[PDB]
Design a protein around this ligand. Sequence first.
Ligand SMILES: C[C@@H](O)CNc1cc(N2CC3(CCC3)[C@@](F)(C(=O)O)C2)ncn1
Length: 167
Amino acid sequence: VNSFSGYLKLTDNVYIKNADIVEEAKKVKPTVVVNAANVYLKHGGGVAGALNKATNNAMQVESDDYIATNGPLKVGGSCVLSGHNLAKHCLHVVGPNVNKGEDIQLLKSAYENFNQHEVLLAPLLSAGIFGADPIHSLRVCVDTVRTNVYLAVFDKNLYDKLVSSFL
Ligand SMILES: C[C@@H](O)CNc1cc(N2CC3(CCC3)[C@@](F)(C(=O)O)C2)ncn1
C-alpha cells in the first residue's frame, strides 16, 4: 500500500491521473519524482521548468554543479539528484526531443531508467514541449517499465484521450 490517490489503473504496474506533477509531488512526497530533463539539466520550461520553480531554483543550482563535475547526460540517460521539497529523490530522465530531431527509438532507453526504482511519480517522457505523441509515449512506458509508475498528466483533455485510446 502506498499514498498515491485517484489514479486509474492501466496495467499491473502502470497508473495514470490528471494532475499537476508539481502539486502531486508536494502532497505525496514520493520517494522518486521523475523530471523530463534535457542533457544539460537546464530546467527552463515544461515539466522541468515547473519542478525547478517549485524548488525555488535549488534544483537548478544542484544541477549546474552536477554538470560542471560530470558533463552532460546522454539522450536516453538519467541521473539521480535530490528531490528537494518535492520528493526524496529526483530522477532526471532525458527523453528524445523531437523538436531537436532526436531518434524516437531512444524513448524506450529513457523509460528503462525507471526500472531502477521500485515506485515513481512521473510525467510522460518526450511529451509536451519535447514534441512526441503522448499516446506513443504511454505505449512505450507500459511496454518498458516493470516497476510501479504513477503518471501525472497535466492536461485534462490529453488525459481523456490517452485513457480512451489505451489498448
Ligand atoms: C503545470 C505545468 O506547467 C507543469 N506540470 C506538468 C507538466 C507536464 N508536461 C509533460 C511534458 C514534460 C514531457 C511532456 C510537458 F513538458 C509537456 O506536456 O509539454 C509538461 N506533465 C505533468 N505536469
